[PDB]
Design a binder for these strands. Structure first.
Ligand SMILES: O=c1[nH]cc(CO)c(=O)[nH]1
Length: 196
DNA sequence: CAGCTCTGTACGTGAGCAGTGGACAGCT
DNA sequence: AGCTGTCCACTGCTCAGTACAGAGCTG
């Protein structure tokens, strides 16, 4: 029990999006974990690498935590949402129909607020997104920038290893910070390309 | 064959948990 | 000196996607 709160109550709770217009980066998670539904803030996981990586990469220049997520769009130009809204312990608990439904809601949200870069916090969710939205399944899907903008916009697609610490192939935040740094570089290259 | 899809399986860190016990002050 | 309770350092866990092999297919 999370301070008295049963796991049953948490499964029903949802995590509110934090979206505005003219954002640079929208961090797209998979779906709310237990701690996320409890706190009502994005990536509150004590082990989760998201915030540490936001700092080590200098995307935030100050060590923030989940409580500051609502202050991100104004200050740092970063917004939050997920592929699937339903709260589950994580990943494998969701169905294919749920993910693709989420993708529809997601691609819809993306072409509304249209940020500069749609950041997929997880390879898995982009595999589903790419196949559904772009009708394309590539043998060797790689991290980083993707060949397709979300339809009818100029929003780019950028994929990173999931900030979850369950990922054994990237054991530490140091092992993931590289993709955040190139995300920051991508952002800067886009701001400059526009300012020209 | 060879390719394609889907399922299951295995894998490293480090934060936080309960349990354990050593240090130690306040007693009698 | 012996007793004893609290405190706390430290223990030994557990647990928060991805790559890939192979099986069941199809071409
Ligand atoms: O990739 C991720 N990691 C963690 C979460 C939530 O805790 C999420 O939604 N997506």
């Amino acid at each position: 029990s999370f301070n008295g709160v049963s796991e049953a109550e948490l499964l029903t709770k949802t995590l509110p999006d934090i979206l505005t217009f003219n954002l640079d980066i929208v961090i797209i998670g998979i779906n709310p974990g237990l701690m996320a539904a409890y706190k009502g803030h994005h990536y509150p996981g004590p082990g989760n690498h998201f915030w540490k990586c936001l700092f080590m990469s200098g995307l935030s220049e100050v060590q923030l935590n989940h409580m500051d997520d609502h202050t991100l769009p104004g200050k740092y130009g970063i917004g939050f949402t997920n592929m699937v809204e339903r709260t589950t312990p994580g990943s494998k608990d969701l169905s294919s129909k749920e993910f693709r439904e989420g993708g529809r809601i997601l691609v819809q949200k993306l072409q509304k607020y249209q940020p500069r870069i749609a950041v997929f916090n997880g390879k898995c969710i982009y595999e589903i997104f790419s196949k559904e939205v772009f009708g394309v399944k590539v043998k060797n899907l790689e991290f980083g920038l993707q060949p397709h903008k979300i339809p009818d916009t100029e929003t780019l697609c950028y994929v990173m290893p999931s900030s979850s610490a369950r990922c054994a192939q990237f054991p530490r935040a140091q092992d993931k910070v590289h993709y955040y740094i190139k995300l920051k570089d991508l952002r800067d290259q886009l701001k400059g390309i526009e300012r020209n």
